[PDB]
Design a protein around this ligand. Structure first.
Ligand code: HEM
Length: 180
């Protein structure tokens, strides 16, 4: 199941509302039904003169394990969207493995406001796509997304009822890692 070819970023988004603070995934939709594990994630994206770099955390709620990454790439000219290469780091941001240039993720921002955002992520590992992933983001763990971001979900052709809510999963975060 490949990622969709019909994803595009929202025009006119203030990139300032996106590349701010830290984000927590409050709700996610993975289109591939062959997955079992559920995750929590938080990340801190930053941008300077067209270059994006972000510190990323995942917690596998089923296996009770976590992993850390640093992603980097360039903003597209055309809207709020980037394809990143990523390295694997430990919790103090020391590099464990440098980026495998055959892997990447493309992150497309569909909405962003002062409290909330909606993004699409297509993760590719060599030939293989992990399929569409949509994530509703908030700055405050277990907060509700804004009405604007909830509208963006519907306008993306999705239904919020179909997303997994992470606030109930028993997430463990590393707020040290995502702060600054
Ligand atoms: C709750 C939300 C999310 C879920 C359910 C999720 C799901 C997954 C899964 C299943 C994997 C493992 C793929 C594999 O086994 O090879 C993975 C890895 C990865 N995800 Fe996420 N993801 C989430 C959020 C994000 C976000 C927000 C980003 C980027 C901003 C992202 C980027 C990545 C990257 C770079 C990896 C590869 C990690 C590595 O190989 O070291 N994910 N994700």
């Amino acid at each position: 199941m490949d990622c969709s070819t019909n994803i595009s970023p929202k025009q006119g988004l203030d990139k300032a509302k996106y590349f701010s603070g830290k984000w927590y995934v409050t709700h996610f939709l993975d289109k591939d039904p062959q997955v079992t594990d559920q995750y929590c994630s938080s990340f801190t994206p930053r941008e300077s003169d067209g270059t994006v770099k972000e510190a990323l955390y995942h917690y596998n709620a089923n296996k009770k394990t976590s992993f850390y990454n640093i992603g980097e790439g360039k903003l597209e000219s055309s809207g709020l969207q980037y394809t990143a290469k990523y390295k694997t780091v430990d919790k103090k941001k020391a590099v464990l493995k440098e980026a495998d240039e055959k892997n990447s993720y493309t992150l497309t921002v569909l909405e962003a406001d002062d409290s909330s955002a909606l993004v699409h992520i297509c993760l590719r590992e060599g030939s293989k796509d992990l399929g569409d992933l949509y994530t509703v983001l908030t700055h405050q763990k277990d907060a509700e997304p804004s009405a604007k971001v909830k509208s963006a979900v519907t306008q993306a052709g999705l239904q919020l009822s179909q997303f997994v809510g992470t606030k109930d999963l028993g997430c463990q975060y590393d707020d040290q890692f995502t702060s600054l």
